[PDB]
């Protein structure tokens, strides 16, 4: 995820960022929209 | 503020929903990419708005003008205050 | 379960509503996702009531 140069922002998107990592939800989503949905069997 | 967010239509990151001609703002999209803003922005406290990136381009410097397109231009050029989209984390990128 | 699901001229399905789909619906294990992959979009149905 990115941000301009020095963005307050960055700070806390990072930590969100990795407590979704950590959570399992990025696994999840990426499990949702590749494969859940695939349509090749 | 509403944060101003780029991304890119590439599915299926973002994707216009069926019945998108009849919807408006965020509610015209879906994908990864939607789901993981709606998460960022639920877990640092902000509203948005997603916005496509004009030219449809993740981002090059042009040697010759030195200057940046695509989602790294929005960003470069303070036309968003983030880029939520399958943008790969580059040298060249990190620079600027 | 392997010879199902390697080949596609053999159709096969479950029970709707019962342990045996969910056990295919959150199986992990390759055979079994692989399985559950096509019975969840095979045409005509595979699942009985």
Redesign the interface.
């Known amino acids: 995820?990115?941000?301009?140069?020095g963005?307050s922002?960055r700070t806390?998107?990072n930590?969100?960022?990795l407590?979704?990592s950590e959570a399992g939800?990025?696994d999840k989503?990426?499990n949702?929209?590749?494969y859940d949905?695939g349509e090749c069997g | 503020r509403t944060?101003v967010v780029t991304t890119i239509m590439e599915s299926?990151?973002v994707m216009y929903k069926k019945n998108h001609e009849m919807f408006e703002g965020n509610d015209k999209y879906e994908?990864?990419c939607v789901?993981?803003a709606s998460?960022?922005a639920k877990?640092?406290g902000?509203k948005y708005k997603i916005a496509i990136v004009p030219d449809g381009k993740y981002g090059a410097r042009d040697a010759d003008t030195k200057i940046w397109n695509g989602?790294?231009g929005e960003?470069?050029y303070?036309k968003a205050?983030?880029?939520?989209a399958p943008?790969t984390i580059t040298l060249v990128?990190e620079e600027? | 379960a392997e010879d199902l699901a390697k080949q596609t001229e053999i159709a096969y399905g479950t029970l709707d509503s019962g342990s045996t789909k969910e056990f295919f619906r959150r199986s992990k294990i390759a055979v079994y996702e692989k399985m559950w992959t096509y019975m969840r979009s095979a045409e005509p149905s595979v699942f009985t009531r």
């Open positions: 995820v990115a941000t301009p140069k963005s922002l806390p998107v930590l969100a960022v407590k979704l939800v990025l989503l990426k949702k929209w590749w949905k | 944060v299926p990151y994908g990864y789901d993981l998460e960022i877990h640092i902000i989602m790294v960003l470069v303070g205050e983030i880029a939520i943008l990128r600027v």
